[PDB]
Amino acid sequence: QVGIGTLIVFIAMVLVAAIAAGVLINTAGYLQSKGSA
Amino acid sequence: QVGIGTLIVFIAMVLVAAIAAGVLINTAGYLQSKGSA
Amino acid sequence: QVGIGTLIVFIAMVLVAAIAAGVLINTAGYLQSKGSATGEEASAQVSNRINIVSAYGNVXXXXVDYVNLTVRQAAGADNINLXKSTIQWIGPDXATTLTYXXXXXXXXXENFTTXSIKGXXXXVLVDQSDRIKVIMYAXXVXXXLXXGXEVQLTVTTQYGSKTTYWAQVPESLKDKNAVXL
Amino acid sequence: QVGIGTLIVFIAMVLVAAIAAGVLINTAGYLQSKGSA
Amino acid sequence: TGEEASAQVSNRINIVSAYGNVXXXXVDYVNLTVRQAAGADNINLXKSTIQWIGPDXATTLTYXXXXXXXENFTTXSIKGXXXXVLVDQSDRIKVIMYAXXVXXXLXXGXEVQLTVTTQYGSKTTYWAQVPESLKDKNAVXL
Amino acid sequence: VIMYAXXVXXXLXXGXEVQLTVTTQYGSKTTYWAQVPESLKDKNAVXL
Amino acid sequence: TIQWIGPDXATTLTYXXXXXXXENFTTXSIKGXXXXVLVDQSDRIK
Amino acid sequence: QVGIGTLIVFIAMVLVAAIAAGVLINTAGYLQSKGSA
Amino acid sequence: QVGIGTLIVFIAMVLVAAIAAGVLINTAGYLQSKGSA
Amino acid sequence: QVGIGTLIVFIAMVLVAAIAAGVLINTAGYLQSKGSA
Numbered sequence: 001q002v003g004i005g006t007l008i009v010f011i012a013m014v015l016v017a018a019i020a021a022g023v024l025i026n027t028a029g030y031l032q033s034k035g036s037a
Numbered sequence: 038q039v040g041i042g043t044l045i046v047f048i049a050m051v052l053v054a055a056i057a058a059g060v061l062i063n064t065a066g067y068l069q070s071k072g073s074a
Numbered sequence: 075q076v077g078i079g080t081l082i083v084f085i086a087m088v089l090v091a092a093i094a095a096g097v098l099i100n101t102a103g104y105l106q107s108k109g110s111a112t113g114e115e116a117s118a119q120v121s122n123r124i125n126i127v128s129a130y131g132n133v134x135x136x137x138v139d140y141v142n143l144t145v146r147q148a149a150g151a152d153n154i155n156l157x158k159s160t161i162q163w164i165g166p167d168x169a170t171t172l173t174y175x176x177x178x179x180x181x182x183x184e185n186f187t188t189x190s191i192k193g194x195x196x197x198v199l200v201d202q203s204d205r206i207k208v209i210m211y212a213x214x215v216x217x218x219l220x221x222g223x224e225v226q227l228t229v230t231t232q233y234g235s236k237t238t239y240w241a242q243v244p245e246s247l248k249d250k251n252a253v254x255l
Numbered sequence: 256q257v258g259i260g261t262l263i264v265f266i267a268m269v270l271v272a273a274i275a276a277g278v279l280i281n282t283a284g285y286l287q288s289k290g291s292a
Numbered sequence: 293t294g295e296e297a298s299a300q301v302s303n304r305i306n307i308v309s310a311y312g313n314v315x316x317x318x319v320d321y322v323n324l325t326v327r328q329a330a331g332a333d334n335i336n337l338x339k340s341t342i343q344w345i346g347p348d349x350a351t352t353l354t355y356x357x358x359x360x361x362x363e364n365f366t367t368x369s370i371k372g373x374x375x376x377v378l379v380d381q382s383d384r385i386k387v388i389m390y391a392x393x394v395x396x397x398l399x400x401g402x403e404v405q406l407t408v409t410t411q412y413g414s415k416t417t418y419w420a421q422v423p424e425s426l427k428d429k430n431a432v433x434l
Numbered sequence: 435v436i437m438y439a440x441x442v443x444x445x446l447x448x449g450x451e452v453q454l455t456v457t458t459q460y461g462s463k464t465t466y467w468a469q470v471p472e473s474l475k476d477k478n479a480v481x482l
Numbered sequence: 483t484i485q486w487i488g489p490d491x492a493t494t495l496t497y498x499x500x501x502x503x504x505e506n507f508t509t510x511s512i513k514g515x516x517x518x519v520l521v522d523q524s525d526r527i528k
Numbered sequence: 529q530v531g532i533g534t535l536i537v538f539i540a541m542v543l544v545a546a547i548a549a550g551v552l553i554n555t556a557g558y559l560q561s562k563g564s565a
Numbered sequence: 566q567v568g569i570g571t572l573i574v575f576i577a578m579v580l581v582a583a584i585a586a587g588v589l590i591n592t593a594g595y596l597q598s599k600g601s602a
Numbered sequence: 603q604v605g606i607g608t609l610i611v612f613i614a615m616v617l618v619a620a621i622a623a624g625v626l627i628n629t630a631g632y633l634q635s636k637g638s639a
């Protein structure tokens with residue numbers, strides 16, 4: 001049943017990576033507007 | 038009888054993966070707030 | 075004489091064997107439904123989650139009175155009924171858990187209301203496009219949020235997935251109609 | 256008549272294993288579709 | 293045996309969070325928000341026990357009914373009818389345990405280990421770490 | 435197998451739980467815990 | 483959806499076709515075939 | 529007299545099954561302590 | 566007599582898990598040294 | 603008896619994860635010292 005477990009955890013890794021990617025892009029967007037001004 | 042044992046362990050395997058998935062996401066959610074701040 | 079004894083006992087063996095077969099299969103039948111259910115709900119715990127686009131707030135006099143969160147269905151999630159989700163408020167004052175209320179706007183008190191932004195339903199996120207705005211009243215869960223405060227919002231869906239957000243009022247609200255918490 | 260008892264119980268074991276085997280495969284199939292999306 | 297053995301594994305309690313109220317300079321309450329685990333039947337919190345492993349004490353709290361808690365815990369519901377039993381996936385209850393009553397008032401940094409034990413034996417564990425800075429906080433998040 | 439839910443009890447609402455034990459003539463029992471989908475918002479037909 | 487936070491109102495605009503728009507936005511096509519869907523990297527939509 | 533023989537063998541079968549049940553749990557008891565450590 | 570059958574099958578998956586345990590650890594052993602170097 | 607097979611694999615799975623943590627820390631340890639100098 002090890003195959004059952006790895007599926008659920010794999011979903012968690014994808015969501016976490018999207019969370020970290022979200023922080024990076026949003027913070028860059030903030031600084032770009034701050035920097036351009 | 039062996040089939041019976043597989044099902045009980047299968048439930049535990051799913052629960053553990055859910056527990057592990059929780060820590061990864063919640064910690065990522067906490068760092069996201071700290072990181073953006 | 076000896077054959078007669080074998081016949082009656084042979085019936086007993088057959089009946090006992092059928093009894094043992096019944097115990098195994100029915101117990102396996104119970105565990106199949108218990109096992110199948112757990113897989114769906116546990117995956118529901120991880121997948122069905124709320125993502126918060128942004129949190130703005132109307133400004134009255136010189137203090138925030140509303141905390142409106144724009145929440146969206148997360149990646150690869152099923153329907154998310156917001157009317158059965160709870161919001162925890164750990165701020166500078168109170169420390170409560172806000173439950174849904176059927177329309178209130180200004181009379182939300184210690185609850186929260188969900189006005190629809192995009193989509194059909196006004197409490198159920200169905201597709202990725204649909205976005206719902208959560209209405210929370212500041213000067214009723216505690217007090218009107220002052221300059222440079224913080225609120226710990228953990229929008230928890232019915233399946234246990236928690237989304238933590240840290241609303242931070244701007245340090246100064248000099249002549250602002252609304253801010254971006 | 257000990258042989259008679261074994262035969263009936265043997266049928267139960269094959270059914271029980273098939274039930275347990277089926278549960279895992281469908282559960283993984285659900286997680287496969289969920290993970291891919 | 294098949295039902296209870298599955299029950300021992302299935303009916304588990306997941307702790308949503310744990311926030312403690314702050315008085316003067318000590319976490320005097322410890323509130324736990326609990327929920328049904330994945331695929332768990334009716335979980336009764338009345339026949340459940342909590343083990344408090346802390347800095348000054350080490351006892352096992354049991355259930356009670358209604359500030360005057362002492363060596364017990366009380367459950368005030370948050371969402372969903374009953375106030376001691378979990379019926380659906382969407383119900384939440386809060387577990388109240390007077391911290392300064394079960395022992396001494398919890399100071400900054402003091403960590404507490406909890407094991408909520410369901411009726412059928414399933415155990416969940418939580419480590420409530422009091423913030424090491426309680427200065428000017430109406431309520432903290434353990 | 436055709437079964438009228440609004441005649442054996444009531445029209446199955448959201449989150450309803452019905453347990454069925456289809457028992458053949460000889461006695462074999464098959465248990466299936468039908469699970470109505472948690473929310474029925476805009477679903478012409480569902481998978482119980 | 484596009485979020486407007488100006489000096490006054492702080493609303494959330496959504497697409498309402500055919501306008502010139504209350505609390506909505508419209509999308510004309512500067513360059514490209516579709517006037518609501520960016521298909522390639524070269525399309526520009528106003 | 530077939531019933532008499534049936535009873536004595538039945539007594540042994542229950543005892544034999546008790547031995548296997550004992551070995552399974554006690555061995556599982558060791559690995560539980562070893563696994564936790 | 567079904568207990569006797571269980572005992573031999575019991576011994577099987579102790580070895581099989583140990584066989585499965587051993588390969589998993591050793592294959593991590595090679596990756597241990599290669600990564601560090 | 604499936605539980606017995608699960609327990610032994612669990613021990614190996616824990617040990618393997620510990621090994622991967624060791625190389626990931628120590629190599630990060632060396633790089634810090636080289637970085638500081």
Ligand SMILES: *[C@@H]1O[C@H](CO)[C@@H](O[C@@H]2O[C@H](C(=O)O)[C@@H](O[C@@H]3O[C@@H](C(=O)O)[C@@H](O[C@@H]4O[C@H](C(=O)O)[C@@H](O)[C@H](O)[C@H]4OS(=O)(=O)O)[C@H](OS(=O)(=O)O)[C@H]3O)[C@H](O)[C@H]2O)[C@H](O)[C@H]1O
Nearest residue numbers: 130131132133139140141142179189207208209210252491
């Ligand atoms: C968080 O999200 C909530 C979602 O509801 C949002 O709520 C709104 O907040 C407005 C305000 O910022 O407090 C409320 O505004 C009032 O009501 C409006 C409407 O009726 O709903 C408007 O009402 C008219 O105002 C005129 C005006 O001259 O003052 C008056 O004649 C009369 O009160 C109303 O007349 S009417 O239009 O003919 O019906 C007006 O706001 S406005 O439209 O922005 O100008 C306010 O009186 C609004 O009701 C409330 O739902 C929060 O603001 C977010 O923070």
Ligand SMILES: *[C@@H]1O[C@H](CO)[C@@H](O[C@@H]2O[C@H](C(=O)O)[C@@H](O[C@@H]3O[C@@H](C(=O)O)[C@@H](O[C@@H]4O[C@H](C(=O)O)[C@@H](O)[C@H](O)[C@H]4OS(=O)(=O)O)[C@H](OS(=O)(=O)O)[C@H]3O)[C@H](O)[C@H]2O)[C@H](O)[C@H]1O
Nearest residue numbers: 155156157158174176197198444446447448472473474475
């Ligand atoms: C999304 O999540 C939200 C979370 O709130 C959920 O909202 C609820 O849905 C319930 C239901 O539709 O599922 C609504 O239930 C209401 O009460 C029921 C019951 O009394 O508990 C039902 O009440 C009927 O009222 C009539 C009326 O004439 O008074 C009476 O004949 C009788 O009491 C009931 O008859 S019935 O409708 O034939 O059953 C009724 O729901 S029902 O039983 O499903 O029909 C509702 O009035 C609840 O109000 C609502 O907030 C959403 O459903 C989810 O999608």
Ligand SMILES: *[C@@H]1O[C@H](CO)[C@@H](O[C@@H]2O[C@H](C(=O)O)[C@@H](O[C@@H]3O[C@@H](C(=O)O)[C@@H](O[C@@H]4O[C@H](C(=O)O)[C@@H](O)[C@H](O)[C@H]4OS(=O)(=O)O)[C@H](OS(=O)(=O)O)[C@H]3O)[C@H](O)[C@H]2O)[C@H](O)[C@H]1O
Nearest residue numbers: 136137216217218219220221222223244245246247248249
């Ligand atoms: C730029 O930085 C300045 C820094 O000073 C900041 O503006 C100031 O912020 C102060 C504070 O909010 O930090 C304001 O303090 C005022 O006095 C307080 C106190 O009396 O010292 C508070 O007074 C309230 O007055 C009411 C009123 O009905 O009389 C009374 O109920 C009670 O005395 C106080 O109640 S309270 O508001 O609920 O606390 C109050 O500040 S408070 O305690 O933080 O709420 C203020 O009236 C000061 O006036 C203000 O200029 C700017 O905002 C930054 O941009």
Ligand SMILES: *[C@@H]1O[C@H](CO)[C@@H](O[C@@H]2O[C@H](C(=O)O)[C@@H](O[C@@H]3O[C@@H](C(=O)O)[C@@H](O[C@@H]4O[C@H](C(=O)O)[C@@H](O)[C@H](O)[C@H]4OS(=O)(=O)O)[C@H](OS(=O)(=O)O)[C@H]3O)[C@H](O)[C@H]2O)[C@H](O)[C@H]1O
Nearest residue numbers: 169311312313314320321322323359368386387388389431
């Ligand atoms: C952990 O979780 C527990 C769950 O119970 C939670 O417990 C509550 O904490 C409240 C507070 O300390 O945060 C307690 O509040 C007090 O008691 C209330 C009630 O009597 O239970 C209210 O009591 C009235 O308050 C008025 C007011 O002027 O102060 C007084 O006249 C008098 O004390 C009471 O008068 S009455 O209403 O006519 O009976 C009041 O809180 S309130 O209702 O929120 O306004 C507080 O005095 C609450 O009792 C307690 O159960 C913990 O806080 C969490 O940490």
Ligand SMILES: *[C@@H]1O[C@H](CO)[C@@H](O[C@@H]2O[C@H](C(=O)O)[C@@H](O[C@@H]3O[C@@H](C(=O)O)[C@@H](O[C@@H]4O[C@H](C(=O)O)[C@@H](O)[C@H](O)[C@H]4OS(=O)(=O)O)[C@H](OS(=O)(=O)O)[C@H]3O)[C@H](O)[C@H]2O)[C@H](O)[C@H]1O
Nearest residue numbers: 334335336337338339340355356357374375376377378411
């Ligand atoms: C989770 O677990 C809790 C555990 O408490 C359970 O909640 C309730 O527990 C009560 C009790 O603690 O067991 C149960 O109480 C019932 O009512 C009592 C009382 O009336 O309040 C007792 O009632 C008996 O009723 C008979 C009858 O003829 O009317 C009378 O002779 C007399 O009033 C009582 O006699 S007795 O039974 O010999 O005591 C009785 O509980 S008892 O006093 O402990 O025996 C109960 O009927 C209550 O039913 C139960 O729900 C939750 O339900 C669980 O989910």
